[PDB]
From a paper:
Ssd1 is closely related to Dis3L2 of the RNase II family of nucleases, but lacks catalytic activity and likely suppresses translation of bound mRNAs. Saccharomyces cerevisiae Ssd1 binds RNA, but does not have detectable exonuclease activity. Transcripts associated with Ssd1 were enriched for mRNAs encoding cell wall biogenesis proteins and Ssd1 was shown to repress their translation.
To better understand the molecular basis for the function of Ssd1 as an RBP, we solved the crystal structure of the core folded domains of Ssd1. This truncated protein lacks the first 338 residues that are predicted to be natively unstructured but is sufficient to bind Ssd1-specific RNA motifs in vitro. Despite the low sequence identity between Ssd1 and yeast Rrp44 or mouse Dis3L2 (22% and 27%, respectively), the structure was solved to 1.9 Å by molecular replacement using fragments of both Rrp44 and Dis3L2. The overall structure of Ssd1 retains the RNB family domain organization: two N-terminal β-barrel cold shock domains (CSD1 and CSD2) sit at the mouth of a funnel-shaped RNB fold. Opposing CSD1 and CSD2 is a C-terminal β-barrel S1 domain. First, active RNase II nucleases have a cluster of four acidic residues that coordinate a divalent cation required for catalysis. These are absent in Ssd1 (5), with the structurally equivalent residues being Ser704, Val709, Glu711 and Phe712; this configuration is unable to coordinate a divalent cation. A similar configuration is observed in Ssd1, representing a second structural change that contributes to loss of activity. We conclude that the S1 insertion locks the autoinhibitory segment in place, ensuring a fixed, inactive conformation. The CSD1 insertion in Ssd1, which is only partially assigned in this structure, folds into an α-helix that blocks the mouth of the funnel, excluding RNA binding at this surface. We conclude that the RNA binding site of Ssd1 is located on the highly conserved outer surface of the cold shock domains and is required for Ssd1 function in vivo.
Author numbering: 336 to 414, 485 to 491, 498 to 529, 536 to 561, 579 to 1189, 1194 to 1248
Amino acid sequence: PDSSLFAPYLPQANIPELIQEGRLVAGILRVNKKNRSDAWVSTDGALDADIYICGSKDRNRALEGDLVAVELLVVDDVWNDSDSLSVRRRSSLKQRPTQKKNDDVEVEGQSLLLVEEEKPLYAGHVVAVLDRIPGQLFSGTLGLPKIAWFKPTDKKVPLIAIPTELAPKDFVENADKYSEKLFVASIKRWPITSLHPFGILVSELGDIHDPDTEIDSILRDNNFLSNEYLDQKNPQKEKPSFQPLPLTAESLEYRRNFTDTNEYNIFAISELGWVSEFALHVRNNGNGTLELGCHVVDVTSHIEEGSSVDRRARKRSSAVFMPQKLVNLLPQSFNDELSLAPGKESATLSVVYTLDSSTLRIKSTWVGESTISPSNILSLEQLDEKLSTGSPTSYLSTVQEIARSFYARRINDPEATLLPTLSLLESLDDEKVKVDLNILDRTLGFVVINEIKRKVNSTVAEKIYTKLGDLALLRRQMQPIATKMASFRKKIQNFGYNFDTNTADELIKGVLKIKDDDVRVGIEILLFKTMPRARYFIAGKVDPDQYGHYALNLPIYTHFTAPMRRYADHVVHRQLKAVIHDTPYTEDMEALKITSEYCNFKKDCAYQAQEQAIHLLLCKTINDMGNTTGQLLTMATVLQVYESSFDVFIPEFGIEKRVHGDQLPLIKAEFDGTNRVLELHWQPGVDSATFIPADEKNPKSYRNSIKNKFRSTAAEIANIELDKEAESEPLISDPLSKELSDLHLTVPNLRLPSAQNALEKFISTTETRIENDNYIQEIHELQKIPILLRAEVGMALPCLTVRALNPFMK
């Protein structure tokens, strides 16, 4: 409690007992991307909150994602530059220091939404690292003489000291020549005697803004080398020896047969750019009951457990889906040969529900090995077409009503309709296969199939836990920590919504009740920020009272429906077959624990890769749409107001960003913390679109490294956009429009004022007043505001930035 020197770690042997006595508690370390000097350790229900870790010393060289042992401290013993900290109305304009402004543009701008942050109840320091996924990789840049400094693009990773004996030979002399090159590094050691970790160079990726390098860098930074199947002789191809194993007649005879096309009309579901791994049938049984059959490719029946393919697929762990590219879980030969197709007989694992034909209540459930021969194959796009423009009593209409009844029971709302849906909560559990430029996009067809798969996964989880108990591989998702729920509740209450938030049940119903699409999306964004992603886990390692999946309002869950892209499903499939055949399941609980946590690591990496690649292409699209103006102008909704800044979200783009007062031509600002109202005092006649803050002409400012420096006046942007609106003409260039079309992506739509010159149409949406020489604009939560939108180009990742239009411009 005096100096700032790292303490050596406690020996591993002591921790197990010390945890049992309550002297230490274990948890996962997460660094605050905004304020990197601090970190939190989340407990798996071992305490009422997260443990605050203040400063570098108390973090004791732990890294993001580490499992750490922490010793608690008196919060008082443990116990500024932010313009978003928020008696009555008072002057609050805050100029962030150059370094803080620079860091904010990256942290806020390099993700689609804004990360959340916020004397704590608990505080501690790290006394040991209990576990770390080994061999983690980091993309970044290298600069300068015995040490070269590697700067990770991941801002939760500290600078890494690279002994210059590992950097390229001619780097010490011309380090500036490599400033625009991307490297991959790893952390090798971090002793108490060094303020920084030491690491090694793994690869040189290439030019920082080369499109292929950009994607390769995203993959490597998220630990996807994607080399498990390549042939040494020829690297362009995969090793032909990797092939699915065919089934013997002994198995095929024993499977429940669904191949008679006179009795079952099975349609395989395909996803754009991906295989078909899920198929369905609906059948009238004739005795007042219906049947919904749910069929999943029986991947593991083609893979010998422990074989080379299994190990290499376990290493990959998750497929990766990006708008620009996809990376398989399995060898290409498996995708091609195992993808469900009409007329092709395929081994499957099926969950078949018998339903009351009038209420659709589930009368019974069958789970077992099967064989199908699809009669049809539909894409989700084709499913959508048929569900909107088709007979309201058709085959597919019945599937929708079944999905709706599953959904209504899941969220405990009998009258529930499948839309509106919660796209962000879905992403807490899984990633998109067909990726959209807007993370908010979900179609009815996807939701129908998704709610059926959620029921199937629920059924399989219940079955394997009942029979295998402590060895079951399950998936849970923890409710928001009390403090974050209390913050979320305060926000929606300020909005005027006072619905119950004590259970996922009532909270989700309150959100879904909101008629205003913008508000409903905004509140979902706020809710999404309070929760970490779901986690695979082994049942015996967790209290059975904490198996719940909060976001899905399910008491138990696992992953069974996507074995072609998730390795966890392979484990679940092998567990289900043991239960089916009542054979002894003899896997070590500790081995399964290591398997589940690795699956968590690679799956969260696949999620990060997907959103990073979306963000990259979206920034390119935003800049192409404003190719002549250097920026876009669109209506946005205010989500949160602070003393010197405010957050806006743009549902048409699926982004949430922060307007900073110190980047606007202001005289002052006043903040009313009781009413959540920020009053901007504008400089009359100064266009925000072209304003350069005085402090950003410093060569230390991020602005100096901006490559796309040109900004047109606001009037020019308004004119071009509104003229094109009436005309139904595109802002996007023809080359990029072709690119997005090939990728089956949709150009974002602007939100324009539906009202006079073009600029005046935007300005008339603002709430303004002139008090003598004060030119005041009021910023209210959930108000619409015109926002200038740009992607700053220059860093490894572009930075989205937003500015309020000056309503007192000429």
